[PDB]
From Swiss-Prot:
Gene name of the record: LATH
Function of the molecule: Major protein in sweat, has surfactant properties. Has a role in temperature regulation by having a capacity to make hydrophobic surfaces wettable and so can function in promoting spreading and evaporation of sweat.
Lineage: Eukaryota, Metazoa, Chordata, Craniata, Vertebrata
Keyword Secreted included in the entry's annotation: yes
Name of this protein: Latherin
GO cellular component terms listed in the entry, alphabetical order: extracellular region
MF-aspect GO terms: lipid binding
The protein's assembly and partners: Monomer.
UniProt note on tissues of expression: Found in sweat (at protein level).
Similarity comment text for this entry: Belongs to the BPI/LBP/Plunc superfamily. Plunc family.
SUPFAM superfamilies: Bactericidal permeability-increasing protein, BPI (SSF55394)
Keywords linked to the UniProt accession: Allergen, Disulfide bond, Glycoprotein, Secreted, Signal
Protein's organism: Equus caballus
GO biological process: surfactant homeostasis; temperature homeostasis
Amino acid sequence: AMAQQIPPEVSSQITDALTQGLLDGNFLSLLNAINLEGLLNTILDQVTGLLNILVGPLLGPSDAEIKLQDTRLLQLSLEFSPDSKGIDIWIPLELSVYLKLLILEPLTLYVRTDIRVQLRLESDEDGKYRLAFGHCSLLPRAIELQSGNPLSLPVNAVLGTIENALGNFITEDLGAGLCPTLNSLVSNLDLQLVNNLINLILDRANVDLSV
């Protein structure tokens, strides 16, 4: 957002309400319930045929499990969509994922993703303007290693793979389990907030557009 930015006042109440929906609802609970098998399975798929299984004498049993550890949510934000006639709602999350290997040291990963859903501008039955939920992509901004020694075999296969997998799981998996919830909260918040975004977009369009 280099052309125009959102007023902290208006953004503060949409983030309030949007986060409130996260709080009041069960946003983090979705994650906790999210099919983590995909990650686990993905990570196992990648880590095998990569390091110790690919170039490693005496292959071991590829047993493992995956767990969510520390799921939390930060303070939301909004931006104007890149001329797409809408606004980007950024829901930032801070999750921590724990993978459990049989005999290998279990590592913990930290992921900080900033969801980006777009509320477009459209006109409803009364010819009035409303917020049109058009886009809901989760954007994995951060994936940091919580535990794991780099002073060993090439990141123990548990780095690039983790980010590969997590960067997928946010967008693919989380944007699957969390998308309906977001399209609920944004569609359940304040009408004033709705209009505040609308009037904003119309303003950033051209004050009101065709006055």
